From Swiss-Prot, chains A, D:
Protein name: Single-stranded DNA-binding protein
GO molecular function, one term: single-stranded DNA binding
Assembly behavior: Homotetramer. Interacts with RecA.
GO cellular component terms given for this protein: nucleoid
Domain SSB: 1-109
Alphabetical UniProt keywords: DNA-binding
Species of origin: Mycolicibacterium smegmatis (strain ATCC 700084 / mc(2)155)
Swiss-Prot record, chains B, C:
Name of protein: Single-stranded DNA-binding protein
DNA-binding as UniProt keyword: yes
Domain SSB: 1-100
Upper lineage: Bacteria, Bacillati, Actinomycetota, Actinomycetes, Mycobacteriales
Residues of the full protein shown: 3 to 120 of 165
Gene, per the UniProt record: ssb
Keyword set, alphabetical order: DNA-binding
Keyword Coiled coil attributed: no
Single Gene Ontology BP annotation: DNA replication
Complex and partners: Homotetramer. Interacts with RecA.
GO CC annotation: nucleoid
Length: 119, 110, 110, 119
């Protein structure tokens, strides 16, 4: 009844890639780079932790809205479901990767303002 | 050890921006989350939210009554123990953004 | 569209097991979540929880006052609008288990 | 300040693998198989969705407690942080995978009871 759900905050590594299926349905893909931060004891200020890079998918109107509104570097908040997709290596094997099927996404207002236009 | 929460919903009213006596910007708003499954609204959940600093000012400039938002933060609770027991909750907002589910946005850094 | 929450904390009291007039088992318990960072407790957050069916009976059999638990469920809110405004929250528990952070458990299916 | 956090519910695919670092610190690894469920419209009851398999890591006392308490098939609830680890293929390349650094874990009481013993 419950999918595995997630919230990620981070920046897009690149402009959202927008495609259209053969039916005309829009799909946008992008990756969120999430930079955590540790205390870094033994003197010293903060220290950025290893970044997590999550590939995200989103469909139809929401995908179009993402393509119209976000770009490389955009700081975003994303909620969605973690899904495992299967791929194919040039050596025959099927290696999986975890991606986010996005439910909702928006630009963070932490360091930015936004002019919102409702559909 | 902090209990975190993500809520999606609509501002019940325009964010109220103030400044502490110290000069620090603070914004208060309430998120109304009404689940649906175009048939049958669920119970409506109204979460009081507070946020600070530049984010506070960006919220006040960018969002209004009705704006659909994604909010993540820490869930807080108070009890006013009394004459009579009263509790409220509140979310100390870490990040907030307008949802692009049903809208577009022109974004402007800094 | 449902707002979910995960909370980690300790039962304030032994779970209270009842049966609806229908015969359905229900358990009520409250989770006290006290964040720490062995220096400085944070604010304590007490979430009323309800769960149903076999899970209700397993909770009542397995957990007591003090038991450290991991709880995920849907956050619910009520307003008692009145003579005077009063709200409470509650978590409709999807799953619950005792944490193995500071304890072991002998587990027994069914 | 915020890591990317997650809650997963599922079953262990196998008994937890327990190891000890050269310092004597315990580490347990295991994978949670999370089976979501869709409505399956166009007549028909429920239908299990594609399972998500997440590799989980946990350390020290908590790892020992997991090894003492859980086995293959154990239904569990897990909270933790999503981390990307780097590996090495037999063809030279470094392929990453997302894992859970476990904060807390416990056996679900959904279909089971537990005798809890506090340390």
């Amino acid at each position: 009844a419950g999918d595995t759900t997630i919230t990620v905050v981070g920046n897009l590594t690149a402009d959202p890639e927008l495609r259209f299926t053969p039916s005309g349905a829009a799909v946008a893909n992008f990756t969120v780079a999430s930079t955590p931060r540790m205390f870094d004891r033994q003197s010293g200020e903060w220290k950025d932790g290893e970044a997590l890079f999550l590939r995200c998918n989103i469909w139809r109107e929401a995908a179009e809205n993402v393509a119209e509104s976000l770009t490389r570097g955009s700081r975003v908040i994303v909620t969605g479901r973690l899904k495992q997709r299967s791929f194919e290596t040039r050596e025959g094997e099927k290696r999986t990767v975890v991606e986010v099927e996005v439910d909702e996404i928006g630009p963070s207002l932490r360091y930015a303002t936004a002019k919102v236009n409702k559909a």
